């Protein structure tokens, strides 16, 4: 499991040379932007339950065949399991946003999730819709463009973090695609 700091270590260990000078610009910019990163992971973590429930309710209210008798989110057991699957993924995307690298998302969440949903008969494409709804909630919560709740932030620009979490979410959607 590698963060942003360990990624340059593994990149320069293939080189077999000491790392300083050239490779330090990204790390010093990562440090100088760290308050916005903590400020963004806190904003995602504070609104987790509303995000998961809203994403699964949106996925059902766009496709009502899931709660149809014989659908994949039909009974209470399947609905609770979908809410759990929902945000299990939110938890790992929050880990990857905190670490600044998506290696923890690959190793513990997405490694084999593709055919696990196949063996279960889970429709792999309504899950993509739920993932995209969670992504759309995450970017609005980071950039403080949420219509239902406004938070308190110091003024400035952090759309790099919004593009990074959007870059994590489509990866988490394309691993099961």
């Amino acid at each position: 499991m590698l963060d942003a700091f360990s990624r340059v270590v593994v990149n320069s260990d293939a080189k077999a040379a000491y790392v300083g000078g050239s490779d330090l610009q990204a790390l010093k910019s990562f440090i100088a932007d760290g308050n916005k990163r903590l400020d963004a992971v806190n904003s995602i973590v504070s609104n987790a339950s509303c995000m998961v429930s809203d994403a699964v309710s949106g996925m059902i209210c766009e496709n009502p065949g899931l709660i149809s008798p014989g659908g994949n989110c039909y009974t209470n057991r399947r609905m609770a399991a979908c809410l759990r699957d929902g945000e299990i993924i939110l938890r790992y995307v929050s880990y990857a946003l905190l670490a600044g690298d998506a290696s923890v998302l690959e190793d513990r969440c997405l490694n084999g999730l593709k055919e696990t949903y196949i063996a279960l008969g889970v429709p792999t494409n309504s899950s993509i819709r739920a993932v995209s709804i969670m992504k759309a909630q995450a970017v609005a919560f980071i950039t403080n463009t949420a219509t239902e709740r406004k938070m308190s932030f110091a003024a400035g620009d952090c759309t790099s973090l919004a593009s990074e979490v959007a870059s994590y979410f489509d990866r988490v959607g394309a691993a099961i695609s």
């Binding site: 610009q25 910019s29 990562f30 998506a102 990866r171």
Partner: peptide, 13 residues
């Protein structure tokens, strides 16, 4: 899929 350190360095320079 995103290298944040290289992106931060490129946005800085």
């Amino acid at each position: 899929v995103v290298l944040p350190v290289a992106r931060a360095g490129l946005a800085a320079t």
